Each structure stands twice: as C-alpha cells, then as structure tokens.
Amino acid sequence: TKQEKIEKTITFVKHILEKDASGHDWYHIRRVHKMAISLSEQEGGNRFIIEMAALLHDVADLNESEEAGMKKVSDWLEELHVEEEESKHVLHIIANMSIEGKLVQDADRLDALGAIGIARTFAYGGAKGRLMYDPTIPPRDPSLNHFYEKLLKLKDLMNTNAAKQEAEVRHRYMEQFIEQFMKEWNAQ
Amino acid sequence: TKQEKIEKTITFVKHILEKDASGHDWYHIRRVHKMAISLSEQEGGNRFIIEMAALLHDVADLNESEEAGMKKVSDWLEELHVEEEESKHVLHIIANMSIEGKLVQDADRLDALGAIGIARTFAYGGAKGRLMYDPTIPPRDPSLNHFYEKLLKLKDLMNTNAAKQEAEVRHRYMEQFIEQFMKEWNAQ
Numbered sequence A, B: 001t002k003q004e005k006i007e008k009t010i011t012f013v014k015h016i017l018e019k020d021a022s023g024h025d026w027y028h029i030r031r032v033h034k035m036a037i038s039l040s041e042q043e044g045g046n047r048f049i050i051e052m053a054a055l056l057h058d059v060a061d062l063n064e065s066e067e068a069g070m071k072k073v074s075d076w077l078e079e080l081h082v083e084e085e086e087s088k089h090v091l092h093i094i095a096n097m098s099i100e101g102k103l104v105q106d107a108d109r110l111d112a113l114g115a116i117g118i119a120r121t122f123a124y125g126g127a128k129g130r131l132m133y134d135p136t137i138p139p140r141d142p143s144l145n146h147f148y149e150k151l152l153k154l155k156d157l158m159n160t161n162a163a164k165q166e167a168e169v170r171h172r173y174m175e176q177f178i179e180q181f182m183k184e185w186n187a188q
Ligand SMILES: [Mg+2]
Pocket: A032, A058, A108
C-alpha cells in the first residue's frame, strides 16, 4: 500500500541524510511534511503526492550538483513503483521547490516564520558572527533586521487558505515578539 | 552636580570599552542602568549610588585580573570626587556583582529574561555550535534546554517588588514562547 511507501520513503530520506550532511535536517523535513498533511486535510489535493513530494523536495536541493538530484528522486519513485501518471507529478513540484504542489510550498514557506524562525535567526546570527540588534543599522547587518528584511513579508506569499491562516497567526507572533523585544531594549 | 558626574561616568565606561573588548557591551550596561532607575523610582534607595553602581559593575568584572578593577573604579570615584561616605557604598555592591545594591542586582539579573534572553540564547547557541532543540536531550546540550536549565528559575531570585513584578511578566513570555515554539516543532 501507499502508506507503506510513504513510510519506506521516510527511511529513504532519513538515511541519505546520514551518508553526508546530517540526520538533523530531518526535523525540518518532517515539520513541513506533517504540516503539508494538516494543510491538505483542509484544502484538498492528493495526499500521497503531497506527502511524497514534501518528503523529497530537500533530497534534490547540497544533494550533488544542479538537476543531478532529479534523477536521484526519479529512479527512486521507480523502485517504489509509482505510475508515471503520479510520479510525473510528484517529482514535478519537487522542481519548483497545482493544488498538491501549492500546498507543499505553503507547508515549506510556513516553516520559516514563528518562534522557530526567531530562533533560527538569532542562531544563524550567532554562527555568522553578528549582533542581535543595532539602532545604527535600521531595517531595509544585525539578526533582528533580517525579520523585516525577508521574513515578515512571507505571509503574503502563502497560496491556500489554511496556510494563509496559520501564517497570519505565525506572522503575528513575530510582530508581538519584536514588540516585546524592543520595549526590553529600552528597559520598558 | 551629581548628574554631571553620572554623565561623565557614562563617558568613562563608554570609553574604556573601546580600548579593548567592544563598545557594544554598552547597550547592556545601559539597559540595566535605565532599568535600575525605573526600579528605584518605585522602591526607594539612593539614586546616585544605584546609578553610579549599575554603571560600573561591569568595569571591574575581562577588565584585568581578579580584584584589580576594584582599585580601577576606586581611584575613579576619586577623580569625580565622591565622599568616601558614599563611594564606600558605591564601589561596595560593585563587588557583589542594602536596598540600593539590592536594586542594582535586580536590574542586572532581569536583563537575562524576556525576548532578549531568548535571542541571546539561540544566538550564543549558534556561535557555540549547537542545535536549538532536540527531543533526545531533555531538560536538566541544545539552546532551548538552557531555558529550564538556568533561566526560568531567575524570577525567583529577584529582591525588590518592582523587579519581581517585571520578572513575572518577562518570565511569563519565555514560558508562552517555548509554548509557541513547541507546537510549531510538532507542526500544530
Ligand atoms: Mg525546505
């Protein structure tokens, strides 16, 4: 059955992430996948495709060299046997990474906003060696600026409704956060 | 007048931070100072002392070597002329870094909780090279754990009321945050 495939595929990614990078990028893959589910079950679209897609968009991305991963995913959907009628659609949106696709994309972009985002940011900021905030460098290179820079404007690129909904809630939190963050910056 | 001293002293720290470390640790010094004010003006204690203290607790800390900064602050309060009757109290609490002191300490510890804290954390996490969260490593080395580790238990060490109040509000936010952070971790 399909679930047995969507299952073994969960092993396919979980593994390939070990022969290199890190089996830590999985928690991201899943978060998007579980999210693509909840999104479909409120917007429609072919689940299996949505799932199989969200689960392999990353394997084609540090995979190798350009569209070299496509055939990497291509020849895989084969081993798992998937009528070209569907596969052609699965490994399709995996390129632009269609209601099915539209949802996967809403499930991936959503995974940038919210608490996690805030953290992902200052975190990436720490590694990259930068401050968190600086009144000498207003928004348009500190970590707090990145929010206005290319994050708060992500809730406007959501496609389906469920995604847009969640996005507004997530987006709102980053707003209120930077609101609580600032008052503290000035000891309020 | 005193304000002219609390002012020139603002220059004393602002400068010494340039001959080494970074004039970036100032935004922390101030945040505590402005905070020690708002706190006194609601709890009492000798302002000037509170201010002069909060403003120099850090200069005695990467200053040099052990209690070598004490005389660094000591001989300074002299140049600014400050009756030993007060100086003895100012550079005093600067050691344990008394209602005046009690407030400075409440104004310094508070500067660890809240949005900034959250950020300071993942930030320090990024630099130190660690994940943000990991279900394989429960609380008691990811950045999220540090919260329960030695942060959420800081609102219990506050002395005066105003500090305790603010602390509860600040503490609450870190709670709700880790609450919004988690739901996202499981795509809620
Ligand atoms: Mg992704």
